[model samples]
Target chain A: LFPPKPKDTLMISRTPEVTCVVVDDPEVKFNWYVDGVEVHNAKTKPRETYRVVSVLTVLHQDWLNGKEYECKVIEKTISKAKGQPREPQVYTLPPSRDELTKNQVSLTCLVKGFYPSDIAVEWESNGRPENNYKTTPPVLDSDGSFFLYSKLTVDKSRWQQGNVFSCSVMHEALHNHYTQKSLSLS
Target chain B: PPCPAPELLGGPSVFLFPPKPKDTLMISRTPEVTCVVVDVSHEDPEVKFNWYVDGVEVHNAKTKPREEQYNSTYRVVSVLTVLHQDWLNGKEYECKVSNKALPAPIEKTISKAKGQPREPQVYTLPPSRDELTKNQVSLTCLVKGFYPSDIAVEWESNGRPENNYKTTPPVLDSDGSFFLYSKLTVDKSRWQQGNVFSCSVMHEALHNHYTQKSLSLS
Candidate 1:
C-alpha cells in the first residue's frame, strides 16, 4: 500500500518524545526536517522490522521551546499534526465466588487507552452512589497512552443480595466521553 | 519519523511547519501555510496568532480554537495563505504564537527556495536581407538562461537609445533557466544605412551584472 500520512504522538515525560509514524514503505529513502532543514537522528530508523516509525526525541528544552517536525519520503513529505486523544475503555471484573461467600470481596473496574491522563471514576451500588471505593491515578502506557484502575470492597452479604455495583468513568477524550462497568451475583 | 505527542507539562505545543514552501509546489489550490498551538493548560487562554511577511505584521490572518473536552485544555489553529508567485519570490513568512500562559511568544519563519543565480546570456540577431527590403525591419535580442526570472532588456541603435522595442516576459526553459526576447522595429532605410544596434541586459548574477550585444550591418 502507498505510504499513509505521518501521524504524531506526544509522550508525557520529563524529556518528552515526539513519535512520527508513516505506514508501510520499502525502507525506501526517507528523512526528517525540523523548521525546513534536513536532519539526521537515528531514532528515525524503524522500530519494528517493517514499520516506518521514526521517533523525534528533542531535548526537553528544545521541545518545550518550539518546533515543526516533518518526515520526508522519497515519494512525499508529511508534517506532524497534533495527536488525537485515545478514549478510555472501561471494564468491570467480578470477584471470585469464594470471596462472595467470605466476609468481604473486592470488585475492580479497569480503564485503559486514554490520554491527558486526568480521569474521574465513581462507584454506585444498586443505582445509588457509593463512596467506599479506591481509584489509582492514571498510569502511563508504552504507546504514550494511559490506563487506570478503581476497586470497591463490599460485604459478601451485599453480593449475595443480588445488588449490582458499577464503576463509572468520565474522561476528556471520550465523546465528551464516558464509560462504565457493572457486576453482580445473582 | 513519528514521535509521541508528549504532554506539555508547563506550556503549550506550538508548531509552525507544514505546506513546505518550495518543496510543495502544488499549482492547484491556493495553499495554506499553517501554525498550531495545542494543549494550552488554561480556560480562555487568550491565545493570539500574528503573521508577518519580512518583519512586518500582516493583517486578516485567520485563527481558530477548539477545546479538548478531556481536560478543558485548548487547541488553536492559525492559517496564513500566500500566493505561489510570492513564495517563489522567496518572501519569508513568520507566524507568532502568543498566549497569556507563555512567558514569551513563539515565532517561526519559512520561505520557498531563494534560488541559485545564473547570469543571462545576451545575443542579437540581424534581419535577413529579404526582410530588409520591407518598409520596416525587426532586429531581435535573444536573452536566455537566467535564474530567478528577473532581468531587464533594452535596445540601442547607432549608440542612441531606441524606443520601438518590445520585450517578452521571462519564460522557463526545460533546464529551469529563463529566456526572453526583445524586438526592435526600425525603418528599412536604417538597415541599409549600416547603423549598428545593440541589446543591453542587467541581472543580479552577471559579471559586472550587465551584458550587451551588437550586430554590425557592415
Candidate 2:
C-alpha cells in the first residue's frame, strides 16, 4: 500500500481553489473541474511534503452567479486510488455594441481560471453548432490555471433577425453536466 | 559687436535630441510616431519640428509644451499621425527638428521595408467515417506568428485556384503579430485520382515570397 495522501478538497468563493490529495508516493496526477468539466490548463506546485498544490483563479461575477469549481486527484498506489472531485469557477463576459455602424460584427467567449486540462468548447447559432468560428489556443495564467477565447462572426442579416449565439463548455468534472453563456443583438 | 549675455557665460551649450524612428506599421491601424528636442539654454529660444512625407513638408503636426527637467534642461516632444493610405502606398515619413541653438535642422525618417510574412503551416484533418463514405476531404492552412498583418491565403488544385474555401480574418496574437486559418473541402474522388491540393500564402515580407504546401495522403 502507498502512503496515504491528503484528502481531495475544493474551495470556491470570489476566487476558486483546489488541492490535490497529498501522497508521499510518486505518480500522482491532478485534474481540475469547473461546473463538472475538466480544465486542461493549470499550474502545479510540488511541496516538500511530497504533495502538489493546484489553484484556478475565478472572477467575482462567476462566483455571484453560482458557478461551481472542482479538483480531482488520482494516484497509483499498489492499486489506483481516485480522490474526490471538486467543481471549477466559471464566468462569461458581457456583450458590447459595434464600434462602427452597419459594419462587420463579432462575439467572443472568454473562459478562464480552470483546471484538469480536458475541456471542450463549442459555438452555436440559435441551437445548431457553428463551424465558421475561431478559437484561440489555451493560455496558462500565472497561477497555473488556463484561459482561452472563441470568436464568431455575425452576418448582418442574422443580426437584423436578432439571432442568438451561445458558447458551450464541457469537461469531465461536470460529469454529464452542460454549461453555456449566450448573447443576442437585441 | 554686442557682448554675449553674462548668463550665457560658461553655461552648457543647447543641443537637439534626435528622435527615434519607428518600424513598419499595419495599414488598418493608426501610428503616432514622435521626435524630440532637449536641453535648450535658459534663454528659452524658439524650437520647432516640421513634418515631411516623401520629402514634402506638411503642416498640422503637434508640439508639446516645453518641460523643465530636474537638471534644469528643457525638452519638447513632437508627434505626427500618419495617414492610412500614405503608409499603404509605402511613403517615407520624416521629422525635422530645428532650433535657434543649432546651425541646421536634424532630420529622422522612417521607411517601409520589404517585410516577410511567416511561412504558414499546412495539413489536412483525417476524413471522418461519414465523410469517408461520402468521399469528402478537408484541408486546413494555419498562418501564425507573422508581423505587419497584410497577407493573402489561397487554395490550389493541380496549380489552379480553388474558390470554394473559407478563410478567417487575421487574428492578433499577444506578441503583436497575427494568425489566421483557411479551410478547403473537396470530394474524396478527387483525392483518389491523385489530385494534388496545395495552400499558398503571399505577404510583402517575402522576396519571391510565395509559399505553398501540398497535401500528403499517407
Candidate 3:
C-alpha cells in the first residue's frame, strides 16, 4: 500500500492584524514564539468541541520589525485526523445617516466563525486609543465556536471630521497574523 | 436488450448546510450560503449548477464555484452571497447540480434550522445627568447576540407591564446575530417611590427563555 497521508500539521499565520496558531486535535498544547524566543503573552484556549486556538496581539510597530512569530502545537494522540483552521470573519457596521444626524454615531465590529475562545478586540481613532467602547462577552455557537461584537460611540463632530476609526482583532486563525477594519465617514 | 446493473462508482450527491440557529439575515448585510455536491464520476463529468430563490431562477452574479479532489471522488462547492432582505421576505434558496454522468439533477434547499437562540446579554444604562436633574429617569434594555430577529422586549414596573416604552427594530450585528434596544422613562417621583423597573425578553433560543433584569435605587 502507498504511504499513508501525512497528518495535518498545525496552521501558523497572521490574520489581518493578529498572529494565530491553530490545530484540530482535541488535546493539544501550544507554545508561541517571537524571533525564536518563547513569548508568554499569547492566549490559548480549547474550543468547546475538538480544537485549540492560540493568538498573539501585535501592534503596527511590532509588525514592521523584521522578526518572525511562530506557534508550535503538540498533539496528544497520533491519528490521520486533519486539522482545519477556520479563520475568524470580520465585518464593520457603519452608522447610518440618521444615526449620524443624531449627534452620536455607533461603530460596531463583529467577529465570527472562530474556534478556541481566546480573542482580543480593541478600538482606536486617529491613531489614539479609544476608551468609549463596549464589547459583548463571547457568545457560544452550536458547533462549539464563538462570536462577539464591540461597539464604539463618538460625537457627531468627531465623526464628521472623517477621523479614521479602527477595530483590531487578535485571534489565532487569520492569514496576515491579525485582522483589522477601519472606517471613516465622507 | 435487458438493462445492465448499475456500476459501483457512486454517482452525484448534494447537500445544503442548514442555516445555523444563530444565523440571521440583516438589512444591508450579505451572508454567504453554501452547497456542496460530491462523489461524482471522474470521467470528464460536465457539471452545471443553477441557483433559485423562492423557487424562481435568480441570477448567479454572486455565486462562486470551487472544486476539490478527495480520494477518488470530487467535491464541488457552490457558495452564494445573499441579501438579508431576500431571506426576510421568506424566499427559499435552492442549489441544483446537473451532470451528464447522473440520471437526474441533484437539488438541495437551504432553510432555517430549528435550534436554541443565543442567550441574549441584557443590561441597562443608568439615568443621565440631565435626566437626573430634570426629575426624570430612563431605563434602557439591551438584547444583544441573538438570532432569528423574532424577539419580544417588554418593560415592567413593579411587576406590571408598562406601555409607555420605545423599542427599536432588531439590529444586525456583523456576525449575523441581532441586538436591539428598548427604553422606558419614568418620573423621578416614581424613582424615589422605590419602584422596581425591569426589562423582559422572550425568544426561541431560551428554554422557557423568559429573561428579566430589574433595576431599583438602593
Candidate 4:
C-alpha cells in the first residue's frame, strides 16, 4: 500500500529541463532589463496561455552564468477584467553566447533560450536592416523546450571602416520588446 | 562627294623614250600609236583614254581604269601600242598622252628601223651594233602564257615585201610553255656588217599585235 499525497515535503531533481516562454494575445508586449536597468520593450507574438496572456519563460544564455534576471508579463484590459489584473512575472536570465560559423567569414547570431520557437532574430548594418546573415530554423530539444538560432556573416572590412553591425532577438509577445547585441568583425 | 577627274602629270614633250632605242631607219614602215600617261597619286582615278593609230584616232578604243581596245593600249600606269609598224619602215610613229587637260602630256616617236615586225608580233632582225656586218644569226620569237593559245610569230627581212618564215618546230618548256627559234646561218661576213637581228612576241588575244625588241650582233 502507498500513500497518495504528501504535504510539506520538498522534492528536487538534478536533471535539466528545457524552459520556454508562452505569449497570448495578438500584440504581446515585452520589456527587457539588463543588470536591473530597464532597457527596451519588445513586441511579442500572442498565445492563449497564462489566462489569455503570454508567459515569458525565462531561460539562460551560457555567458550570463550567475546573473539574476526578472521577467514580468503585464496584461492590458479594456473595461472588462477589472482589478483582478494579470501580474507581471519575473525570472533570472542565463548566460550564453554559443555561436557557430556556417562558412568562411560567416558568423551566425545564436540565441540559446526562448519560447514558442517563433522568436525572430534581426541583423542590422549601420543601424539598417541587412539580410546577408542566415538564421537556422527553430528546433525543439528533447526536453520539450524550443530554441532559436540566427546567423550573420561578419565583413571585417565594414568593421574596419567603423560600420556598426548588430543582431537583436525580439519576442513579439513582450510589449514590442527586444534583446540586442552588437557584433565586432575582428 | 564626287571623285575628281584624273590628273595629267605633263604631256609628252618628245623626250619620253623607252630605255631601248627603236632605230630601223631604212625599214620604211610607218605605224600610228598612242601613249596615255596616268598619275596614280590619287587613290584610284577614273581614266578615259582614247588611242590614235597612225595619226587617225580610233574612236572607240577607249577604256577606264585599265583597258586596251582597237589599236589603243591601256594600262594602270602606261600603255603603248604598235598599230601599224609594217606600213612605214623607218617612218616615225608618234604617241600622245591625253586626258581632261594635258597635265602630264608626253609624246615620243619611234623611227621605223630597216626591218620591223609586221602584224602585231612578227619577227625582225635584232639591232646591229655597227653597219659593217651582215652575218646571219639565230633569233627566237616565243610567246607563252597566252589564254586560248592561238598566237603565232612570223619573220620578215629587208624593206621589200617578205613572207613569214617557216620554222622546223618550237620547243616546249617544262611548264607547258612553247618557244619558237629560227636560225639564220647567213654568211657570218654579212652579219659582221652589223645587221639588226630581232625577235618579237605576239598575242592573238590582242588581234595579232606584236611587241618587238631588237639586238644587233656587230
Best by lDDT: 1
Q: List the global CA lDDT of all models.
A: 0.65, 0.56, 0.63, 0.37
lDDT of 3 by residue, A1-186 (tens): 011111101213333233343534366666666666777876765575364556565443344332455666642211221335457766665664335556667776656557655567779876788876766655554455666667787787888886888888876566654678887776
lDDT accuracy of residue B10 in candidate 1: 85
Q: Write model 4 residue lDDT over B19-111, tens digit each, in one string.
A: 122221112443223344533333333444444445765454323255433323334433443433342334444555554434664455544
Q: After superposition, how far is residue A110 of candidate 4 from its true place, in Å?
A: 1.0
Worst ten in a row by lDDT for model 3 chain A:
A1-10
CAPRI classification of candidate 1: incorrect
Off by over 4 Å in 1: A1-186, B1-113
Q: Considering summed lDDT, which 10 consecutive residues are worst modelled in model 2 chain B? A: B16-25
User: How much is B17 displaced in model 1, in angstroms?
Assistant: 24
Which 10-residue span in candidate 4 chain B carries the lowest summed lDDT? B18-27
Which scores higher on TM-score, 1 or 3? 3
Chain B TM-score, model 4, reads 0.31
- Number of clashing residue pairs in every model? 19, 26, 17, 94
**Local accuracy of candidate 1 as per-residue lDDT tens digits, B105-205:** 88888765468877776656665434555677667566656886756677887678988666656666545877665657688788778888888887656
Chain A, model 2: TM:
0.48
Residue-level error in angstroms, candidate 3, position A13: 35
Q: Cα deviation of A153 in candidate 4 (Å)?
A: 2.2
